[model samples]
Target: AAVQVGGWGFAWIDNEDFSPTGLAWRSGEYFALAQMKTPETAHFRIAAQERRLRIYLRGQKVVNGRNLSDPDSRTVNLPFLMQTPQGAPTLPSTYHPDVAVWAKVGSTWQPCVITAINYSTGDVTFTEPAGVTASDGIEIYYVHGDGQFRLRVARDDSAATVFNQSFSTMHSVDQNNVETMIAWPQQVELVPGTRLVLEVFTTQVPMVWNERSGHYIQIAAMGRRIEV
Candidate 1:
């Protein structure tokens, strides 16, 4: 079992330290929207992961990960930047807890919390108790998804038994929602040469989420990192 170190998604910006690969979103035959990237310096133990979009509220509910709503609604990367020590950026849900917050410290994107957002003053208060750094930049995004998934950590030099598995989003979404996460049944240690792959399915195949800007999803992991 693993405790929460922080959440992870796609690289909102280029050359992020957490992701060892590109920040590109492509479509998959069985996966909806895909973003494949390598592990970070510290080994990650993914306990849960999720996706969300406010627009999904208007659509029909899903059963067994079969998204009956806008199956065509794909994923993209959107970054609402806060570029100062006291910089203010109005986000999609300024006060809502679900709106995932991330901050770049030494170029690494990590999870952050929101204490307050002063709309009257355009000043937002960020409570960075863990992964966020005050001096670095801040970003808020609306991550979207509409399916069940499998988070596979595949080793590039693998020829042995394929290290792959699938789990439902609700596995640890006890405190969250269907659109919240894919809680792992057990901790999956991220080793070297292993890339995280989110497996799902959308009608679009082998394509990017070019449908619209900000029409993207962030892939993140909520886990602790083991020491080297």
Candidate 2:
């Protein structure tokens, strides 16, 4: 026996970053709208307080692996200007955490947490606390890292994994926009204020040889609960 969900409908669209705002309305209980986007091959997980067995994309059903899957998932390159010590531009007064600052070490990009901001002088100070070794040789710069736009799907605010896939190149990769419809077939459950997240991390690849392109990734997702 499973709890039934009704009045299922589409909820929200998360463009680029994982900022879900749409809420599922229920007269008796609280249900949240789950939306996520990630590198096509990233592991996807789900959980539910009430029985949730199926998923819909743009109001359609899809095969578990055949439809909403990508095997040769790689990140597209796009250019972003790096910040220098003296030739830096001022950060926006309306600062957004999603808009991150990065540092350049050799040829790799690392993330930096902003500790102080000065819009008047356009001077920003930050710290390297994660994934990077602090060094005087490392020059400070600003760019968005995978964390800035990555999403994290969770079960009751904890980690969960419902779907897992690896590389095979069975699915094609498009240079432009690629869309897939995703759905599931087992009962999952969630309670009031429970959350589901989608996260993405990129493997930097060149669009062509000899040139580094800072490609931008665009992600969008929408989901609603269904009764079965």
Candidate 3:
């Protein structure tokens, strides 16, 4: 099952560093809301190429193939950046991590932690402390243009596939690439509060080119989990 990332929604502000603005919330009287604000306009302009908004939370990250801590952040080149002709500045081959590359737990931005993970087969890794209790679920927020947003969540727990669902885009990516933030309140189950291990397979067709213009089209993507 998808870990509970939030009980209520959350708010965020974009930053040049690794960490996003801490969770924030406002009263809705009857219900709560999740909102995220960002300063990037260009980052939101992906609809021209049929790209969709992809948002995910991960606890596992491998630096140099090790599931530990790494201080340096980087921009990886993608192949879809070269799909278009006359590679313009909009289509580069390298893509940077949504989280800051030089992200840190403290103000100085050093050291990292991989928390809440699962090692089981076909099971989603709980992204909370092991043996701790609570269903600290994970939050998954996404927005797209016209196509349907289909997500397939699976993990390595007991060879069991856990979460799978799909959502239809309210609009097409071509209209606007604006940012729509969402929060998974209580993402981690407090009762089962377990670290999780899982991968998010985006079944949407999208395109992004870092700075290299590699012509990379996103047919599918995965997020590695970390241990909290």
Candidate 4:
């Protein structure tokens, strides 16, 4: 079955090559910009191909990410809602991209709803008007350091920690650079007709004056997207 929500029609996300980006859409629901692609790099060149997923919620507002949860449990955030008392709350004020955490491996944290989508630059931004929610709570699990990451959930949209702590863990990276995980969360429900800007990036740590070359080759970034 595909996700069928909003005006968008579908039963369930059924893409063979639809590599999971930690986001999923349930039956009768639609997702936004589901992405799974190989990023480009010099030290390790992952095939370049960006994909997007479209996820949205029904009634009120509910953001659901099948693989979103705490890392220790190898899980992802569970089904939740993003709503506002005074209608939809104001859009987010800031947006943070996934960047280098410790060192060495270079990569971008998957962008969740950062800001609204910036068409010109493809950057992310959070929006208020288009931000329709099921309730006021939200669940999020982002990347931390290579072989290291964390997951969390929050109900408030004002404070960063408002996204209360949920779980955290490390997924071993193989020779192929494939990060493995037992449980993970993906996308949050979005409004219909909402535009999302998605992207994946790699980190490039510069060598320090007296540090080992390997010291400057680490990349640990969280991926993110924006819903306005």
Best by lDDT: 1
lDDT of 2 by residue, 1-228 (tens): 454544433332323333334442222222332344333222222332212212111110011111212222111122221221222244432232212444444457554445555433434445433323334322322232111122234543465544322111101222232343223323333333434453322233111101111222232223344333
lDDT of each: 0.34, 0.29, 0.21, 0.22
Per-candidate TM-score against the hidden true structure: 0.32, 0.24, 0.18, 0.16
Q: Can you write out model 3's per-residue Cα lDDT over 1-228, one digit (the tens) per residue? A: 333222332222111111222222222211111111212211111112222223322112222211224322222221111111111232111222211111222223222222211112212111221221212211111122212222222122332222222222222122233454221222111112221222222223231111211211121112222222
lDDT of 4 by residue, 1-228 (tens): 343322223222222212323433233222221222322110111111212211111111113222322211111221221221112223342222221111111121222333342323423222222222223222232222211112222121221110111112221122232334222233333223221222111121111111110111112212223222
Residue 218 lDDT (model 2): 34
Determine which window of 10 residues in candidate 4 has minimal summed lDDT. 205-214
Off by over 4 Å in 4: 1-180, 185-187, 192-228
Given candidate 3, what's the lDDT at residue 179? 56
> Clashes per prediction?
13, 20, 93, 71
Q: lDDT-based ranking, best first?
A: 1, 2, 4, 3
Candidate 2 matches the true fold with a TM-score of 0.24
Question: Which model, 2 or 4, shows the larger TM-score?
Answer: 2
Among these predictions, the greatest TM-score belongs to 1
